[PDB]
Design a binder for this molecule. Structure first.
Ligand SMILES: C/C(=C\[C@H](C)CCCCC(=O)O)[C@@H]1O[C@@H]2C=C[C@@H]1OC(=O)\C=C/C=C\C=C\[C@H]1O[C@@H]3C[C@H]1O[C@@H](/C=C/C[C@H]1O[C@H](C[C@H](O)[C@H]1C)[C@@H](O)[C@@H](O)/C=C/CC/C=C/C2)[C@@H]3C
Ligand SMILES: [Zn+2]
Ligand SMILES: [Zn+2]
Lengths: 105, 104, 53, 105, 1114, 249, 157, 95
């Protein structure tokens, strides 16, 4: 969580999904404690799987987890790893370097 | 000893919790007006590492040879800031949840 | 060493070489007017002249 | 593929030819100088080659002189193939051996 | 300097207004100076008509119509400049006099309506959009018509394409499969053609009658007995097929779209669609792919007769050929006007749905225009274009030519109707036809090669988007003065004679007349010739036209020098080249970067600021000079007065010069004393050697202007504020800030200097006491505000030349949400040639200054004059840009003869002329040496000697007579500066115009040791104090693997990037003179392992004994 | 086809346009019929195999000619998969190298064969099982790791099944694709498949190659990071004898 | 070496009633050549005041005890009705070519340092010719030419 | 002016990389003791030109290569165990 100029923030984006999930777990975890309607818990349970679906591999099933505002799909624990700067490939591909420099030859 | 092979496996819920250091199965985080991580939430110092290098979140002994210290009210361990790179958390689900990987 | 324009010297042969090439081209069109050479034949012949020249 | 141990020890080889068969004309010609070197330079002899009153010992690394001689020695009709050690038949799996490949450092 | 003009062919037509493409396009889409009665279609005028007898729900029961009568272009609320200052788009409101009728009657013409805002084009050809001048490039697509084509997926067969005007109908393709079935492909849906044909009433037996016995092709189109049915039922089934869902018999409804009316398929009102669909196809047409309301049933007009030619090409008598898709009689040009107008279509299209929407929501008694119209679908559709379409570039402003040339660009990419950046190779090649219209030379070297191009000097886009070149009708012998611009197609039927061709008086003079026809170069009898080229200038671009000896330059290097000129930055002592081609005065004219008189009067006032002239009677105007203003590319457009106090002005003549202009002529660089020889490895490969002399004479020096910008936004933490009250800052750091926070003008600014002070709030903690106790006791008042000012970035700096302020509020000013006030600081910088800079010449001889020499060195003529730049011969032969060589020779004349030259393209100087002038020159140059008391010193005699052994001088001639020999061949005896000893064997020396290009070492060249590490990626990136950090690509990763460089690779992978632990250990070691490493564990490793745990998955790390390791210890 | 497209065609083992037929069998040639329909028979004693040609096809065996196992009948390019089965794996290797070079050569380039060889061999790294001893009967296995079973179950623990296999021409990409170590395998088009699988099996790397260790940030297993050299210690005259006088204590 | 102009702050400025701008005026000044006279004279400061419809031209400078403008004529600033000027132009004694970016000038602020082209020598050439002086048919007659801006003499140089 | 004496240096060893590794491993020790570790001493030490006279060249690896080139050091591939290698190392004036 990094602060862009002022009180604007750069949240990891994975951090987002990692709440989407804790809110369902605590909703479909309250319902069950006091007042357990059948159909209601069902859809909450269908949601809590779907919430873990998002943290893992957002893009799948079909509906991507949007963010209140934009339709950009936001990255999942899969994307962190799924190449192009994605952990497995970042090294053999990129990395900016600390004793360098250029110029016209 | 020095590494020579790397082996990937599956995660026994007994390990995922063995890793964990604490449970972020509690609210949501980062103060914006202050910069303090919110209690029992995705950055809580109490469960991962101290956000600051050694030192607590109010005032303790900024030592070196004492190894593993937890405070009066708050629960922060005075032991280098790199820790927050590595300490795991966990969310204890209320029911099931399949790894979509092994699903789809 | 430098390159001035008169250093891109054209051979004294080129003029005649092309006069000669011109003449043989007249002899190729005339040879088609008769019927010796097919449409294609005469093309090929014209092309194989310039390639050589 | 990395040079991992000097010589796997195996005794298959490759037979780099010095003549070429033109499928159009069925004819044979002694191959372009350049290509010969590209098959031979810096190779290690698999089995001995005798020609023009010269023995080339088993497992000799062939210099550019040697190749150049080998081509002379093929025009005098004494040599048709060269029994040469190659990566195609090296036996160290996870990389070629020192004695295969040979040279082009 | 007196100018000598070269060559014959007397230019019958001057070059047309140039920016004609742009400027005259708009006009005819905006008949703003023509009464709304006339306004004969096209443009905005038609785009209304195309939409505006607009009905409402149901077919003739519910009332309300709303009909367009006339539009009115508004008036600009902000002056061309306010706009560029306040950050606005030069617009004018657009009003529609609409009229809504009823079923009980009531003709309400609501006094116009505001439908949106129309961006106005400048005199230039250019737009202004949210500040910043944008240019809309003209695109090209397939000129609508009917085409056929071969079939890429099935050999020996063909497809058929029915392509209408863009945004005026859908793309209909016809293709026969291995089934036999003919299939219509429209809107990416594919049904059996028959179904349509059934609808248009063709009967199983009529088809065979019409379409049989060439091929067993009908046999396939047949068999669907099942739907060779009731033409009404056909219609239903086809509607179900085209829009799955609604299954009723009002299928006339949609089928009326891909049929009749000027809703969709309007392949023309009666133009290049009908016309060309007639000649290719079976003649006789109206204007729509089929006609509907014949009486209540469709009547086919194009579908079958196309199919005819489709079958009649799958066997087919000769005459039923394929079609040349790349012919310019098949390629159309969407100019600005039309694209802008096409965008009205999208606008008004949307505006209608949202009227018919409000016709349904509202009580019909009170609904009015103004109450039906919204004013935002026209805006958002037309704001979107000028702002966000690919075709709307910035505006290449480096120099006058660069800009001018931008406007005349043509590109096959762009929006929708446009090929992607992964298709088209047959397109790219310079197809025959391009001649006189498009340039065989201008295209960018890679990627979009051929996908973008220059419009040719004399070319003109016409009536319907076809480029037309001028020709000279020759009435069977005499070359008439009448000039006939004609199509790419209206050309393949004539025999046109070249301009290079001679003449006597007004008629052809030779007996074997060269000419082409269709495409083939042809030799032809004089009486057998019909038309004539007006000039060779016809054939090439504006820039390609500026190369004085193009004829002698290989076309590759020509294209390099055609661009590259467009990179040529303007200079303080900018100077028109020694050897010109003619357009150099006019290029500057049509660019309007130079200021010219309005109506022959008399200048009254003249200063660096204004030129004010009293025009004969007609009042008095003051012309303000734009002065050291900053071009889009950071170049410094600045006008200089070229006219004196109290002087009579020539009609419309140079009152002032532009940025790259010398007394009205184009000045992209300097002409300068050159010597083509190797130096000492200093002009190796492409490098140039310079004489310091040029810097002392401040020659190749130019003024660049950066532009810095800062915003103050509101924040959950408080407002970003633009103070000069910046915390902790020494009143010496603040020294250059006015009482506002913004640097003074004329302030000299070095890197790390506050340009605009700005405090932001930020809540990074709370100070726990003791610290608060300490704070007071020792004085310094704890502050609520962080520094965050502007500041000059590492590398930059210069003189502060202007500020700009825009506040949320302020009249015309509209900054984005959050942003409240914006500051802009402009910083000038004299530049001066530098090792690392790159000079080019007109023949594409690019290269970097690699060594400046002091005049003590530098080859020098005998008279003492040193040369200026030493250019390597080894450069010449491989590229075949021999024009540069010739240019040096004519130039050498000039130097001595004291003149510049105008040598037209394929019409300029010949050697015969050049050597005559070199003769005249040597006679004055050597006449001086004699008349001063000298002649041919030992040094020249020693050369001249071996010079004949070199067969380069005539033996048995005097050393003086032998010197001339050489001077005429264009070479001279140079003298080595270092050591007075002569260069053995003569050197060609002369004046060559050479440009300084957009690139400079100043802007490049960066070097980091350490510093700013991103908090996100943890690898060095960006630099507030120290800068930079270079990428180690996967290609370099290979190299290091290829070399055995284990640790070096691992260094680049850990301690100089993410590895916090490592870098820190390393830098703490270098500071202390320690060896550095022993990097504990690649951070990369830890990261991945943990980034894996997060996804379940154990990832055990194990040593050779196969037990675990823990790469962490914590 | 020529140029780079050829070199890929080759390095990727790609069954080209104009496969220009080869005879599957030895025997005697017999061209039959012109313009109407063009077919060619290579019929030996016994079998009569027939090879129908485009008709336009510029065949390069004239009637009567005797022919070879996999010999070209027609001209054009040759399928490297048709060549494998008809005429083995070496003949394949020898085609690939000599064809790839046919272009670099044809143009201007001069490079040594070994490079192309090194790569080509990798195209032959794996083989598919027919009738196994341990594992499932269909799986693709590395040529060497099958000998880890073939000449293992026919020596010390001799018996069962020698594990029969088949030669398997892998295109450069495909071969790169099927590469044991998951770390490396991850960097290719679908990282999930790799990990999903490799997680189910207690899969281990060992990190033999380089693409691996760069991923981890480990010191490349080559050059100075070669096991054969990096353990090399340097002791220094007086350091050695002084180190000797604390060894017998 | 550098200039003061009245109401000018940097080079990229302009002065009203002056067709010239500061840049172009400076390119002028560069060419001006001041002969010194006193050899104690290390660095003076010239002062020119100009006004009204005048072509200001070097020689329009203020004369000073130990200063001889060697190239009067020479354009400095064409002035139109309503043009002032007042320059403080500083002449230093140096050698060779010192770029303005190298030296800098603190004759107060708004000073704009000027590129320094010191050398009096304007061009040199030399002639190795045949002599008539009764020895070998292979001797040398040298003649160096030398041109200078009259501030120092060919001979002195 | 390629690496001084490198032809000789390449010949000293089996696999060239070994050479690097020794140079490195030596330039290592030769640094972690202020050069009080040289074998070459007398008037063999490499040196530096200046605005000043000949000073001891401060380049470990440069020294390391000069050193090696005199046969005075030895390459144990496995001679003297790593546990005992860091032992008697920190002895002759290390800190
Ligand atoms: C690639 C491209 C535009 C590029 C940004 C520029 C062209 C690059 C080719 C080259 O310079 O070699 C395309 O262009 C248009 C439509 C789709 C494509 O869009 C594209 O693929 C990509 C972008 C298209 C439009 C982008 C618009 C905006 O992007 C930035 C701000 C807006 O304007 C851009 C300015 C572009 C002007 C360029 O002008 C050229 C020199 C530099 O490339 C630039 C100064 C001049 O030489 C000028 O004569 C060339 C004009 C190109 C004419 C092409 C028109 C078709 C600028 C880069
Ligand atoms: Zn605490
Ligand atoms: Zn081997």
């Amino acid at each position: 969580m990094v602060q862009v100029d002022g009180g604007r923030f750069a949240t990891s984006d994975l951090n987002d999904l990692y709440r989407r999930l804790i809110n369902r777990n605590n909703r479909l975890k309250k319902l069950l404690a006091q007042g357990a309607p059948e159909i209601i818990i069902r859809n909450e349970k269908r949601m809590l799987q779907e919430a873990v679906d998002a943290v893992i591999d957002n893009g799948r099933r079909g509906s991507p987890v949007t963010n209140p505002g934009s339709e950009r799909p936001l990255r999942s624990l899969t994307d962190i790893l799924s190449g192009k700067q994605g952990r497995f490939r970042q090294n053999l591909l990129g990395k900016r370097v600390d004793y360098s420099g250029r110029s016209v030859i | 000893k020095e590494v020579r092979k790397v082996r990937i496996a599956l995660a026994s819920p007994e390990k995922i919790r063995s890793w964990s250091y604490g449970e972020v199965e509690k609210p949501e985080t980062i103060n914006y007006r202050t910069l303090k991580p919110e209690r029992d939430g995705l950055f809580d110092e109490r469960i991962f590492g101290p956000i600051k290098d050694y030192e607590c979140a109010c005032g303790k002994y900024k030592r070196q040879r004492f190894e593993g210290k937890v405070c009066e009210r708050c629960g922060v361990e005075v032991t280098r800031s790199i820790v927050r790179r590595y300490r795991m958390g966990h969310i204890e689900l209320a029911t099931p949840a399949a790894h979509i990987w092994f699903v789809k | 060493i430098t390159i001035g324009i008169d250093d891109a010297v054209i051979p004294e042969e080129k003029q005649r070489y092309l006069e000669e090439a011109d003449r043989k081209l007249r002899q190729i069109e005339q040879a088609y007017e008769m019927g010796f050479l097919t449409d294609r034949e005469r093309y090929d012949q014209v092309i194989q002249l310039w390639t050589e020249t | 593929i990395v040079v991992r141990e000097a010589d796997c020890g195996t005794t298959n080889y490759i037979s780099v030819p010095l003549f070429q068969m033109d499928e159009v004309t069925r004819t044979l010609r002694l191959r372009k100088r350049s290509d010969i070197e590209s098959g031979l330079y810096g190779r290690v002899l698999a089995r001995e080659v005798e020609a023009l009153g010269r023995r080339l010992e088993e497992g000799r690394y062939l210099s550019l002189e040697d190749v150049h001689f080998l081509i002379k020695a093929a025009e005098a009709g004494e040599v048709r193939e060269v029994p040469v050690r190659s990566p195609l038949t090296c036996q160290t799996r996870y990389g070629v051996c020192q004695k295969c490949y040979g040279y082009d450092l | 300097m007196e100018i000598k003009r070269f060559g014959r062919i007397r230019e019958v037509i001057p070059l047309p207004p140039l920016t004609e493409i742009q400027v005259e396009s708009y006009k005819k889409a905006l008949q703003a100076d023509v009464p709304p009665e006339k306004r004969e279609n096209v443009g905005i005028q038609a785009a209304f008509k195309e939409t505006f007898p607009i009905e409402e729900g149901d077919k003739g029961k519910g009332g309300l119509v709303l009909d367009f009568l006339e539009y009115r272009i508004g008036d600009p609320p902000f002056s061309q400049d306010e706009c560029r200052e306040k950050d606005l788009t030069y617009q004018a409101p657009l009003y529609a006099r609409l009229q809504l009728i009823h079923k009980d009657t009531g003709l309400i013409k609501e006094d116009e309506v505001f439908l949106g805002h129309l961006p106005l084009m400048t005199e230039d050809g250019s737009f202004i959009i949210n500040g910043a001048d944008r240019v809309i490039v003209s695109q090209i697509h397939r000129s609508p018509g009917v085409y056929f084509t071969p079939d890429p997926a099935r050999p020996g067969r063909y497809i058929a394409s029915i392509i209408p005007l863009p945004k005026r109908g859908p793309w209909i393709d016809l293709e026969v499969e291995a089934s036999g079935v003919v299939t219509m492909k429209v809107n990416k849906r594919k049904f059996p053609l028959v179904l349509l044909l059934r609808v248009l009433g063709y009967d199983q037996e009529t088809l065979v009658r019409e379409l049989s016995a060439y091929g067993d092709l009908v046999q396939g189109l047949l068999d669907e007995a099942v739907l060779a049915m009731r033409p009404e039922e056909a219609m239903v089934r086809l509607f179900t097929l085209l829009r799955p869902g609604d299954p009723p018999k009002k299928d006339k409804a949609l089928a009326y779209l891909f049929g009749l009316l000027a809703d969709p398929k309007r392949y023309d009102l009666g133009e290049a669609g009908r016309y060309k669909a007639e000649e290719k196809l079976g003649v006789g047409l109206s204007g729509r792919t089929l006609v509907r309301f014949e009486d209540g049933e469709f009547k086919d007009e194009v579908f079958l007769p196309t199919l005819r030619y489709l079958f009649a090409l799958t066997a087919g008598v000769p005459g039923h050929e394929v079609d040349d898709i790349d012919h310019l009689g098949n390629r159309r040009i969407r100019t600005v006007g039309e694209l802008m107008a096409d965008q009205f279509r999208v606008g008004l299209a949307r505006l209608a749905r949202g009227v018919r929407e409000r016709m349904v929501m509202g009580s019909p008694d009170t609904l009015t225009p103004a109450k039906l119209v919204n004013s935002r679908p026209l805006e958002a559709a037309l704001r979107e274009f000028f702002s966000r379409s690919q075709l709307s570039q910035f505006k290449d402003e480096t120099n006058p030519l660069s800009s001018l040339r931008h406007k005349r660009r043509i590109s096959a990419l762009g929006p929708g109707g446009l090929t992607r950046e992964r298709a088209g190779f047959d397109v790219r090649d310079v197809h025959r036809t391009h001649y006189g219209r498009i340039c065989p030379v201008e295209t960018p070297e890679g990627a979009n090669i051929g996908l973008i191009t220059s419009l040719a000097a004399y070319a003109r886009v016409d009536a319907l988007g076809f480029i037309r070149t001028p020709y000279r009708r020759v009435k069977n012998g005499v070359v008439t003065e009448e000039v006939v611009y004609m199509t790419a197609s209206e050309e393949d039927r004539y025999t046109i004679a070249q301009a290079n061709t001679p003449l006597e008086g007004d008629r052809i003079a030779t007996d074997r007349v060269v000419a082409r026809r269709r495409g083939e170069p042809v030799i032809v009898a004089p009486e057998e010739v019909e038309f004539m080229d007006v000039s060779p200038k016809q054939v090439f671009s504006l820039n390609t036209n500026l190369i004085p000896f193009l004829e002698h330059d290989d076309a590759n290097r020509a294209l390099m020098g055609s661009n590259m000129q467009t990179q040529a930055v303007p200079l303080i002592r900018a100077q028109a080249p020694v050897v010109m081609t003619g357009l150099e005065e006019r290029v500057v004219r049509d660019s309007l970067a130079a200021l010219y008189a309005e109506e022959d009067g008399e200048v009254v006032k003249v200063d660096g600021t204004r030129i004010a002239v009293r025009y004969e009677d007609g009042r008095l105007v003051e012309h303000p000079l734009r002065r050291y203003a900053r071009s889009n590319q950071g170049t410094a457009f600045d006008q200089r007065p070229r006219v004196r106090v109290g002087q009579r002005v020539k009609k419309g003549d140079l009152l002032a010069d532009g940025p790259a202009s010398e007394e009205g002529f184009l000045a992209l660089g300097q002409n300068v004393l050159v010597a083509i020889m190797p130096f000492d490895g200093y002009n190796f490969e492409d490098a140039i050697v310079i004489s310091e002399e040029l810097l002392k004479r401040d020659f190749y020096t130019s003024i660049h202007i950066e532009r810095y910008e800062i915003e103050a936004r509101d924040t959950k933490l408080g407002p970003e504020r633009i103070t000069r009250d910046i915390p902790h800052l020494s009143e010496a750091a603040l020294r250059d800030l006015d009482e506002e926070g913004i640097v003074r003008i004329g302030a000299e600014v070095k890197p790390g200097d506050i340009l605009v002070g700005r405090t932001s709030f930020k809540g990074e903690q709370e100070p726990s006491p003791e610290e608060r106790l300490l704070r007071s006791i020792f004085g310094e008042k704890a502050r609520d505000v962080k520094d965050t000012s502007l500041r000059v970035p590492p590398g930059e700096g210069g003189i502060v030349v202007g500020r700009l302020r825009l506040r949320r509020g302020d009249p015309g000013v509209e900054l984005k949400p959050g942003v409240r006030e914006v500051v802009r600081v402009f910083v000038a910088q004299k530049r001066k040639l530098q090792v690392g800079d790159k000079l080019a010449n007109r023949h594409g001889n690019k290269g970097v200054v690699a060594k400046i020499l002091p005049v003590e060195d530098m080859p020098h003529l005998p008279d003492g004059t040193p040369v200026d730049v030493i250019l390597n011969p080894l450069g010449v032969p491989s590229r075949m840009n021999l024009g540069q060589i010739l240019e040096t020779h004519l130039g050498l004349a000039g130097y001595f003869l004291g003149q510049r030259y105008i040598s037209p393209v394929f019409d300029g100087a010949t050697e015969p002329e050049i050597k005559e002038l070199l003769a005249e020159a040597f006679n004055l140059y050597f006449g001086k040496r004699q008349g001063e008391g000298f002649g041919v010193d030992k040094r020249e005699k020693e050369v001249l000697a071996r010079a004949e052994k070199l067969g380069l001088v005539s033996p048995g001639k005097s050393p003086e007579e032998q010197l001339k020999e050489l001077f005429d061949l264009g070479k001279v005896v140079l003298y080595d500066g270092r050591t007075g000893e002569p260069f053995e064997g003569p050197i060609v020396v002369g004046q060559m115009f050479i440009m300084k290009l957009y690139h400079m070492v100043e802007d490049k060249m960066h070097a980091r040791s350490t510093g700013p590490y991103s908090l996100i990626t943890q690898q060095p990136l960006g630099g507030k104090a120290q800068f930079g950090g270079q990428r180690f690509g996967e290609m370099e990763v290979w190299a290091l693997e290829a070399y055995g460089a284990a640790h070096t690779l691992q260094e680049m992978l850990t301690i100089k990037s993410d590895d916090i632990e490592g870098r820190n250990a390393a830098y703490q070691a270098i500071i202390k003179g320690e060896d550095v490493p022993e990097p504990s564990v690649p951070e990369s490793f830890r990261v991945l392992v943990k980034e894996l745990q997060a996804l379940a998955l154990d990832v055990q790390t194990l040593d050779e004994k196969d037990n675990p390791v823990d790469i962490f210890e914590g | 086809t020529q140029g780079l497209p050829r070199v890929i065609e080759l390095f990727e083992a790609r069954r080209p346009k104009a496969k220009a037929v080869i005879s599957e069998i030895d025997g005697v040639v017999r061209i039959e019929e012109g313009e109407d329909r063009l077919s060619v028979f290579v019929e030996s004693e016994g079998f009569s195999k027939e090879y129908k040609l485009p008709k336009d096809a510029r065949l390069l065996v004239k009637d009567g000619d005797y022919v070879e196992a996999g010999q070209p009948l027609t001209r054009g390019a040759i399928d490297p998969h048709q060549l494998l089965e008809a005429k083995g794996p070496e003949a394949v290797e020898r085609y690939l190298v000599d064809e790839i070079q046919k272009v670099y050569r044809a143009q201007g380039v001069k490079l040594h064969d070994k490079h192309i060889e090194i790569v080509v061999r990798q195209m032959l790294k794996y083989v598919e099982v027919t009738d196994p001893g341990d594992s499932r009967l269909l799986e693709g296995q590395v040529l060497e790791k099958w000998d880890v079973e073939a000449l293992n179950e026919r020596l010390i623990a001799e018996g069962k099944v020698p594990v029969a296999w088949k030669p398997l021409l892998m295109g450069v990409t495909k071969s790169a694709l099927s590469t044991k170590s998951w770390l490396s395998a991850a960097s290719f088009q679908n990282t999930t498949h790799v990990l999903t699988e490799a997680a189910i099996a207690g899969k281990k790397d060992e990190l033999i190659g380089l693409k691996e260790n760069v991923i981890l940030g480990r010191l490349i297993p080559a050059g100075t990071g070669s096991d054969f050299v990096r353990f090399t210690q340097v002791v220094d005259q007086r350091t050695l004898k002084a180190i000797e006088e604390a060894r017998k204590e | 070496t550098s200039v003061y102009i009245e109401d000018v702050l940097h080079e990229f400025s302009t002065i009203p009633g002056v067709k010239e701008d500061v840049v172009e005026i400076i390119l002028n000044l560069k060419e001006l050549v001041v002969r010194f006279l006193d050899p104690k004279m290390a660095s003076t400061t010239l002062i020119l005041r100009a006004e009204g419809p005048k072509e200001v031209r070097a020689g329009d400078f203020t004369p000073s005890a130990d200063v001889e403008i060697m190239n009067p004529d020479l354009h400095i600033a064409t002035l139109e009705e309503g043009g002032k000027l007042y320059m403080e132009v500083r002449v230093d004694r140096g050698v060779g070519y010192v770029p303005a970016e190298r030296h800098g000038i603190k004759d107060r602020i708004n000073a704009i340092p000027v590129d320094a082209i010191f050398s009096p020598v304007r061009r040199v050439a030399f002639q190795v010719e045949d002599t008539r002086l009764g020895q070998r048919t292979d001797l040398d007659k040298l003649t160096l030419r030398i041109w200078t801006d009259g501030s120092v003499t060919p001979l002195e140089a | 002016m390629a690496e001084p004496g490198i032809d000789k240096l390449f010949g000293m060893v089996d696999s060239k990389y070994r050479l690097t590794v020794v140079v490195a491993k030596r330039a290592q020790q030769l640094l972690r003791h202020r050069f009080k570790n040289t074998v070459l001493e007398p008037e063999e030490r490499p040196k530096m030109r200046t605005l000043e006279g000949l000073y001891d060249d401060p380049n470990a690896v440069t020294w390391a290569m000069k050193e090696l080139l005199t046969g005075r050091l030895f390459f144990g591939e496995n001679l003297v165990p790593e546990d005992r290698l860091q032992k008697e190392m920190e002895r002759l004036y290390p800190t």
